[PDB]
Amino acid sequence: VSLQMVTVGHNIALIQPGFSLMNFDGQVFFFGQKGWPKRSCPTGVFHFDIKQNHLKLKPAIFSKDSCYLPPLRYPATCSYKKHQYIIHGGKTPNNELSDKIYIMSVACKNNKKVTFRCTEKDLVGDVPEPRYGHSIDVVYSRGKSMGVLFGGRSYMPSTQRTTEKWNSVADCLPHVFLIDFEFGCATSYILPELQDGLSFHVSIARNDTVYILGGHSLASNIRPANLYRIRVDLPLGTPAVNCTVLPGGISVSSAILTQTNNDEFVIVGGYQLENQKRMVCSLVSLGDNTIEISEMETPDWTSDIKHSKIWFGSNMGNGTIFLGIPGDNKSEAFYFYTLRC
Amino acid sequence: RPRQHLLSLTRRAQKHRLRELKIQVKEFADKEEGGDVKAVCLTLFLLALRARNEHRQADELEAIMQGRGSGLQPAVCLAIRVNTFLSCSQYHKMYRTVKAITGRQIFQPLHALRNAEKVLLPGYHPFEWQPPLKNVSSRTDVGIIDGLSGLASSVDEYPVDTIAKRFRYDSALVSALMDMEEDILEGMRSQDLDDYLNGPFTVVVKESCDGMGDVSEKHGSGPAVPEKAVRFSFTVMRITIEHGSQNVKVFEEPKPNSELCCKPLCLMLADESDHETLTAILSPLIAEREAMKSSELTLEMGGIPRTFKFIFRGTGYDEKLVREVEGLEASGSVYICTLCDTTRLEASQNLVFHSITRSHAENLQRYEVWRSNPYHESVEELRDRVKGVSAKPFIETVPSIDALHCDIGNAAEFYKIFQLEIGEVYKHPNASKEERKRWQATLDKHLRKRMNLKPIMRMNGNFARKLMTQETVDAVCELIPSEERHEALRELMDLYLKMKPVWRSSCPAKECPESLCQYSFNSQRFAELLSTKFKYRYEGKITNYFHKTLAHVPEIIERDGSIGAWASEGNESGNKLFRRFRKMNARQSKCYEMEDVLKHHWLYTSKYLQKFMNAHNA
Amino acid sequence: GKMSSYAFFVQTCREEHKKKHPDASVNFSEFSKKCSERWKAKEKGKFEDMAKADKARYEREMKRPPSAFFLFCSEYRPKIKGEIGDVAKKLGEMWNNTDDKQPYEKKAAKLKEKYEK
DNA sequence: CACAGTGATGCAAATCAAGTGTGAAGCCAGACAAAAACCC
DNA sequence: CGGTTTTTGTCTGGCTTCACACTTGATTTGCATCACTGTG
DNA sequence: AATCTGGCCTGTCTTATAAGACAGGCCAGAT
Ligand SMILES: [K+]
Ligand SMILES: [Mn+2]
Ligand SMILES: [Mn+2]
Ligand SMILES: [Zn+2]
């Protein structure tokens, strides 16, 4: 795990907390710019390529049949296998939460310039309320595909929300949401095991199971050291969801997850306490029926990272994380690093 | 022993010296005034004084024989504090020193002024909304509220880098009306109406919002805020009452652009260009305002409940802010108007014939068109179709023209034409940057010799005021060789000075009716002058504000009656108070500066306190 | 004060007058005349020597409606008179010893709004 | 060891308001005499 | 060093006017307190 | 060999002294 400083181009300002990175065939792309898209890049999506520790953000264009989604902070993002990306929830530049779901897919790749398709998927049934800071993952059970969505936050409901606390947020009800992309329906399951609301947790999905790690529960204000397994069965009848608590769970909120090899992932970053960053890193080894969380060697953090109050980042995909910490102000607002594995 | 002065002697000693004149006066009293020596000496002294032009002593002695005590009511003291700009800590020094030299407590101590304040600030008077306001709390004791409005600040969330405080929109308006109460009563009286008449009043409110630069950050613990502030203010413009089938102008602001009547509603330390934080702070304000569009405020004035209906007009915005909050592109764009769909090129070819088509409603539609792309169009075609509306509006403004910013950007254009006329660009197309720099230097030196104008870095209100005269064109003409172009300049400025009073005066219909009449005629020759004798600059392009000024001024005038009174200039002049108050009238610490300024800025805008200063001039 | 010889003279004359005429109220402007004539060389020596003794003596000397307690107090005043500083001590002790003061405070509550307006 | 503020807070500290005979102080009256400055 | 010119008082009974008596629970004031300001 | 791209730059543009919009030259890399 080698840490590396990164320089940024003229449009460094776009990069903010809550941004997202998507991987299409090794080419990384960037989404969720600060402010609304400007005439320099109307889509708000950028080809994000670091060459010799210098990052250039270059505008990407959309297909004629694309939606022009708003920039979204803290959406639930997922990869679908023909490779495509799911974006659900998030905050808009106007601080609204969007219930809409967008699918990002490569339309054309002529001469190493990529056109994207951004289509909106309508959702009926038990649609999850607008959310940020929540996870969405795709499971495979008995030759069937199903989407799972758990946790997060939203504003108070229209009946109780008052302008004096207009921005107050509360954890969504911790209902697991099965979401079939083929039909556009969503099914809600209440479980006894998932009693508290949870946001900014990590989600790792293998076959028919999704693990829920860390996170923060607003009511309790606790970053619980619990691990939750959620198994989904896809028989010919209505699917069934079973949850199991498994002790030995990490205590971290807003952690970042990257895949080093098949069936092994690294969990870095995030916070153990409001004022205490989580400097340690954990290695997760998956078994068809078992999950293994191991302490691993901490990286050689610089004195900036050690003493920053906040840090943010996302996974670039090839087992390399892109990190950002608040920088000096007159200069550039943020300082960026790339940690490889 | 030489006779001392009579005033030095002891009582017993001055008695001996006047006992010869004392017995002489007792006689005069019994013979003439019935032995009332007290009254005859009191009058002989008082008259002796005024004989030596010493009226003050005599007048005070009069007031002390009458014996009436002297002292200012706290609410009087508050008005003197608020309106003479004194700080409490300076006022306390005055108060203290007055009480110790006169022995009398002429001014009241601070705790009482601080009690008088309570009436004039939001949260004090009770009210109610029928129907109740949507998503608003119905508490009526809500003064200064935290401007983040419960914004989430845990370390997982988006970083909170601003401080803000505000009043709740209604509770503010209420305290606004109650300030105007005495002025509202008289407005019915001088309209020959019943004082106690309580019909459905209507309050038209001007809304204003600006961003400020160069707001120094305090040391000390707190959010690492930016060095910019944002202000949201409202002015009460007119109150009409419905008496029969007439709308009776009970009240109309005499000075619509004065710092005095602009009311502070929201102070934040934040950058207007930072959309994320701007919407976060102001969205609770726009919801409270939305709610009040569909309710009537029942409020009790002088023992009689009255009802008020509210019309909100956002017109104290500059073009850059308008374009930000209504989802339009920035102002380089080819979509140059915020009032119409015209394109920069088109505005240069047609110039005058364009009607007001944009609106907060339409943009909101167009954004949703943008985001959804229903005709599965290309992004050029999409943008054409939505005429550049490519973000989601979040504040509703009037489609209008700010006069101040209109006056400014126009003069700066003329300042440029002046330069390009010195360099004879009308004849010689190309010129080096060094050649241009000296045209500006020439003109700058000359505006100093002839017009006493020192050069300034950014264009001014007053500079524009004083540059856009015909005397200045005389000045600038001395520099240009050809008198065929002295004529073009002179006419261009004549047309502009015939037009200007329309879009700057409070009531053009009353104040320059002929200029309002001819506006469509003069604006056509101005446009044609630019199109012929100024091809070099205005072929294929025109400035945003030349378009607004040449195409939409008459329509706006007939829709609203005025442009000049809905200008942001009152808001701008309020900024001057922001700066002064933040230094000299607020606790000097990161967690108090914003509320202390908000509060004490409100008092400075209280007509009830202002009246006490005009009390001499009955 | 320090007394001159003539002043001791006048004081002694006043004493003689009071012992000769006990029921008699002297006039001042006439008494000054008659004393001044009596003063205007051996009689006066006694007073002259008395005055220096008085000088030595001078040397030595050189070196809004009312509180509920007020409403209660005013009524109980006549009984204490039957029984100012002493009266108020008694009034305060008995008031302190006393739902007892709820009615006087209700009267004061009615009077508080009237003071305010 | 710069220095005079920037406004709200909250705890001393002082004032209030009433009940009414206490002595203390200044005062008037006429006439005259102490003291304390000025005219060789 | 008196001669001479003004301050200052005595003497007295009784005239007014006033503050001072003490207590109790509120109001109204006085004042130090906090962490920062700007001119460099 | 040519062309048409499309990105990068500088400059001037609103409006307005720090940015965003836009045009147009400049040249390398495809059709
Ligand atoms: K002004
Ligand atoms: Mn502005
Ligand atoms: Mn401004
Ligand atoms: Zn227009």
PDB file of all heavy atoms in Angstrom, chain B residues 552-564:
ATOM      1  N   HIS B 552     -36.808  46.150 -23.268  1.00  0.00           N
ATOM      2  CA  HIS B 552     -37.825  45.816 -22.285  1.00  0.00           C
ATOM      3  C   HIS B 552     -38.179  46.965 -21.360  1.00  0.00           C
ATOM      4  O   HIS B 552     -38.885  46.744 -20.373  1.00  0.00           O
ATOM      5  CB  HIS B 552     -37.388  44.629 -21.426  1.00  0.00           C
ATOM      6  CG  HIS B 552     -36.882  43.461 -22.203  1.00  0.00           C
ATOM      7  ND1 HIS B 552     -37.368  43.125 -23.447  1.00  0.00           N
ATOM      8  CD2 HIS B 552     -35.930  42.543 -21.911  1.00  0.00           C
ATOM      9  CE1 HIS B 552     -36.730  42.052 -23.891  1.00  0.00           C
ATOM     10  NE2 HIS B 552     -35.851  41.680 -22.977  1.00  0.00           N
ATOM     11  N   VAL B 553     -37.693  48.172 -21.603  1.00  0.00           N
ATOM     12  CA  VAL B 553     -37.967  49.203 -20.605  1.00  0.00           C
ATOM     13  C   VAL B 553     -39.431  49.631 -20.657  1.00  0.00           C
ATOM     14  O   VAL B 553     -40.053  49.745 -19.587  1.00  0.00           O
ATOM     15  CB  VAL B 553     -37.021  50.406 -20.739  1.00  0.00           C
ATOM     16  CG1 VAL B 553     -37.560  51.596 -19.946  1.00  0.00           C
ATOM     17  CG2 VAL B 553     -35.646  50.015 -20.216  1.00  0.00           C
ATOM     18  N   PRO B 554     -40.048  49.855 -21.829  1.00  0.00           N
ATOM     19  CA  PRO B 554     -41.440  50.339 -21.791  1.00  0.00           C
ATOM     20  C   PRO B 554     -42.415  49.306 -21.247  1.00  0.00           C
ATOM     21  O   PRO B 554     -43.292  49.654 -20.443  1.00  0.00           O
ATOM     22  CB  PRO B 554     -41.729  50.698 -23.255  1.00  0.00           C
ATOM     23  CG  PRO B 554     -40.404  50.766 -23.932  1.00  0.00           C
ATOM     24  CD  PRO B 554     -39.565  49.753 -23.220  1.00  0.00           C
ATOM     25  N   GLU B 555     -42.279  48.038 -21.647  1.00  0.00           N
ATOM     26  CA  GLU B 555     -43.172  47.008 -21.125  1.00  0.00           C
ATOM     27  C   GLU B 555     -43.103  46.940 -19.608  1.00  0.00           C
ATOM     28  O   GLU B 555     -44.131  46.959 -18.928  1.00  0.00           O
ATOM     29  CB  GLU B 555     -42.845  45.645 -21.732  1.00  0.00           C
ATOM     30  CG  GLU B 555     -43.712  44.535 -21.161  1.00  0.00           C
ATOM     31  CD  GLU B 555     -43.615  43.201 -21.921  1.00  0.00           C
ATOM     32  OE1 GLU B 555     -42.759  43.033 -22.833  1.00  0.00           O
ATOM     33  OE2 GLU B 555     -44.415  42.297 -21.588  1.00  0.00           O
ATOM     34  N   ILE B 556     -41.891  46.869 -19.056  1.00  0.00           N
ATOM     35  CA  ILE B 556     -41.744  46.804 -17.604  1.00  0.00           C
ATOM     36  C   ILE B 556     -42.395  48.009 -16.952  1.00  0.00           C
ATOM     37  O   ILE B 556     -42.990  47.900 -15.873  1.00  0.00           O
ATOM     38  CB  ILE B 556     -40.262  46.688 -17.204  1.00  0.00           C
ATOM     39  CG1 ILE B 556     -39.663  45.385 -17.699  1.00  0.00           C
ATOM     40  CG2 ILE B 556     -40.117  46.727 -15.693  1.00  0.00           C
ATOM     41  CD1 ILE B 556     -38.239  45.226 -17.286  1.00  0.00           C
ATOM     42  N   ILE B 557     -42.308  49.178 -17.597  1.00  0.00           N
ATOM     43  CA  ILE B 557     -42.860  50.391 -16.992  1.00  0.00           C
ATOM     44  C   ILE B 557     -44.378  50.308 -16.926  1.00  0.00           C
ATOM     45  O   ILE B 557     -44.988  50.691 -15.920  1.00  0.00           O
ATOM     46  CB  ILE B 557     -42.388  51.660 -17.731  1.00  0.00           C
ATOM     47  CG1 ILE B 557     -40.983  52.005 -17.281  1.00  0.00           C
ATOM     48  CG2 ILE B 557     -43.224  52.853 -17.340  1.00  0.00           C
ATOM     49  CD1 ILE B 557     -40.916  52.224 -15.788  1.00  0.00           C
ATOM     50  N   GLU B 558     -45.012  49.770 -17.972  1.00  0.00           N
ATOM     51  CA  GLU B 558     -46.460  49.643 -17.925  1.00  0.00           C
ATOM     52  C   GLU B 558     -46.900  48.485 -17.043  1.00  0.00           C
ATOM     53  O   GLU B 558     -47.991  48.536 -16.472  1.00  0.00           O
ATOM     54  CB  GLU B 558     -47.035  49.494 -19.330  1.00  0.00           C
ATOM     55  CG  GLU B 558     -46.900  48.112 -19.941  1.00  0.00           C
ATOM     56  CD  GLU B 558     -47.394  48.080 -21.380  1.00  0.00           C
ATOM     57  OE1 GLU B 558     -48.155  49.007 -21.744  1.00  0.00           O
ATOM     58  OE2 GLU B 558     -47.017  47.150 -22.142  1.00  0.00           O
ATOM     59  N   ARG B 559     -46.079  47.447 -16.892  1.00  0.00           N
ATOM     60  CA  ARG B 559     -46.476  46.365 -16.001  1.00  0.00           C
ATOM     61  C   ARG B 559     -46.411  46.797 -14.540  1.00  0.00           C
ATOM     62  O   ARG B 559     -47.294  46.449 -13.752  1.00  0.00           O
ATOM     63  CB  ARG B 559     -45.616  45.125 -16.232  1.00  0.00           C
ATOM     64  CG  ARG B 559     -46.056  43.902 -15.413  1.00  0.00           C
ATOM     65  CD  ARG B 559     -44.973  42.802 -15.348  1.00  0.00           C
ATOM     66  NE  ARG B 559     -43.784  43.294 -14.657  1.00  0.00           N
ATOM     67  CZ  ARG B 559     -42.538  42.980 -14.987  1.00  0.00           C
ATOM     68  NH1 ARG B 559     -42.297  42.153 -16.004  1.00  0.00           N
ATOM     69  NH2 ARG B 559     -41.537  43.509 -14.302  1.00  0.00           N
ATOM     70  N   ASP B 560     -45.394  47.573 -14.158  1.00  0.00           N
ATOM     71  CA  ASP B 560     -45.088  47.800 -12.749  1.00  0.00           C
ATOM     72  C   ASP B 560     -45.164  49.255 -12.326  1.00  0.00           C
ATOM     73  O   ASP B 560     -45.207  49.534 -11.117  1.00  0.00           O
ATOM     74  CB  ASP B 560     -43.675  47.286 -12.406  1.00  0.00           C
ATOM     75  CG  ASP B 560     -43.468  45.806 -12.754  1.00  0.00           C
ATOM     76  OD1 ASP B 560     -44.471  45.103 -13.027  1.00  0.00           O
ATOM     77  OD2 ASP B 560     -42.300  45.339 -12.756  1.00  0.00           O
ATOM     78  N   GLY B 561     -45.157  50.188 -13.274  1.00  0.00           N
ATOM     79  CA  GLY B 561     -45.198  51.597 -12.982  1.00  0.00           C
ATOM     80  C   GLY B 561     -43.842  52.243 -12.841  1.00  0.00           C
ATOM     81  O   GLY B 561     -43.676  53.413 -13.212  1.00  0.00           O
ATOM     82  N   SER B 562     -42.866  51.500 -12.324  1.00  0.00           N
ATOM     83  CA  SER B 562     -41.529  52.003 -12.056  1.00  0.00           C
ATOM     84  C   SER B 562     -40.492  50.922 -12.341  1.00  0.00           C
ATOM     85  O   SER B 562     -40.782  49.720 -12.306  1.00  0.00           O
ATOM     86  CB  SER B 562     -41.390  52.460 -10.602  1.00  0.00           C
ATOM     87  OG  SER B 562     -40.329  53.389 -10.468  1.00  0.00           O
ATOM     88  N   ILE B 563     -39.273  51.374 -12.632  1.00  0.00           N
ATOM     89  CA  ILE B 563     -38.085  50.549 -12.527  1.00  0.00           C
ATOM     90  C   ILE B 563     -37.190  51.031 -11.399  1.00  0.00           C
ATOM     91  O   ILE B 563     -36.699  50.232 -10.597  1.00  0.00           O
ATOM     92  CB  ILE B 563     -37.320  50.521 -13.859  1.00  0.00           C
ATOM     93  CG1 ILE B 563     -38.222  50.027 -14.977  1.00  0.00           C
ATOM     94  CG2 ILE B 563     -36.167  49.597 -13.748  1.00  0.00           C
ATOM     95  CD1 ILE B 563     -37.570  50.094 -16.333  1.00  0.00           C
ATOM     96  N   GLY B 564     -37.026  52.346 -11.291  1.00  0.00           N
ATOM     97  CA  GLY B 564     -36.062  52.925 -10.378  1.00  0.00           C
ATOM     98  C   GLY B 564     -36.278  52.620  -8.909  1.00  0.00           C
ATOM     99  O   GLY B 564     -35.331  52.761  -8.125  1.00  0.00           O
TER     100      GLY B 564
END
